[PDB]
């Protein structure tokens, strides 16, 4: 338990350094002239607020119970759930915007402006707040084994139907649809790019074109690798009865941190490898 608590705090410091550094450069060195900067700012803010909720959970696995009260548990559950869904939807809308910019250069110019992005950000925040209602309505402490308490979610009647319904609800809107949309948009972008005469022909053209495919593949693969074991183990745990063992407790606590490891990779993929951000960073550092 001591070694697993070390990994929880290591990922926290890395996530706070990366997301705070990105915001500082955009706020002072660059500006919000481009819509891409508008989307990146919200992505970074959501990721940082998501990473801020890590330290409390590490105390629960270091200890065997929740040292705080019910109010802190009910606040942290809601904040964490809001940040998760708003980050996922922000990256989805960024993927949609890239497809519109690249595949429809002339028809989309009449419907792309900073006012629209500013409204879309508020819309996605409001939608996350609206869809997080079940967690905020039902939450609190619960007695566990090993003679202690833990911060969890309680259901009316404590039936398994509610557990299965909640797991399906968070799986449909959290994994499937964003993944399908991202895959379709990136596939169509890759198809479109290869058909342009100005962007092909010479060997250097192919060398530069391979990088786009590599980056798209990495962006797609990281999401699945970070978010698949959590959902598969949660789904399997609500179907078959499983005898409690310490190894299973360690495995469940390990698969949780990979969820937070994805938010430590967004600045690398979207900011530190962009030419514009690379040029802007040297201006103030």
């Amino acid at each position: 338990n001591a070694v697993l608590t070390f990994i929880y705090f290591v990922v926290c410091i890395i996530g706070l350094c990366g997301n705070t550094l990105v915001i500082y450069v955009i706020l002072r060195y660059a500006k919000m002239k481009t819509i891409t900067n508008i989307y990146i700012l919200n992505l970074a803010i959501a990721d940082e607020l998501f990473m801020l909720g890590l330290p409390f959970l590490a105390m629960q696995v270091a200890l065997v119970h929740w040292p705080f009260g019910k109010a802190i548990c009910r606040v942290v559950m809601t904040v964490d759930g809001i940040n998760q869904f708003t980050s996922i939807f922000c990256l989805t809308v960024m993927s949609i915007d890239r497809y519109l910019a690249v595949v429809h250069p002339i028809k989309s110019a009449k419907w792309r402006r900073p006012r629209t992005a500013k409204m879309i950000t508020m819309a996605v925040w409001g939608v996350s707040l609206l869809v997080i209602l079940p967690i905020m309505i039902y939450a609190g402490l619960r007695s566990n084994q090993w003679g202690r308490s833990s911060c969890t979610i309680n259901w009316p009647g404590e039936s398994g139907a509610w557990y299965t319904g909640f797991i399906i609800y968070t799986f449909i809107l959290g994994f499937l649809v964003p993944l399908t949309i991202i895959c379709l948009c990136y596939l169509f972008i890759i198809i479109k790019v290869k058909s342009v005469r100005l962007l092909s022909g010479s060997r250097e053209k192919d060398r530069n074109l391979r990088k786009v495919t590599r980056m798209v593949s990495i962006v797609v693969a990281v999401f699945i690798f970070c978010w698949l074991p959590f959902y598969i183990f949660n789904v399997s745990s609500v179907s078959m009865a499983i005898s409690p063992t310490p190894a299973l407790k360690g495995m469940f606590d390990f698969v949780v941190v990979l969820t937070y490891a994805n938010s430590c990779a967004n600045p690398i993929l979207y900011a530190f490898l962009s030419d514009n951000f690379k040029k802007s960073f040297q201006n103030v550092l």
Binding site: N144, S150, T152, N234, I242
Partner: peptide, 8 residues
């Protein structure tokens, strides 16, 4: 068992 983000 284990559910959500905590094992009980």
């Amino acid at each position: 068992x284990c559910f959500x983000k905590t094992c009980x």
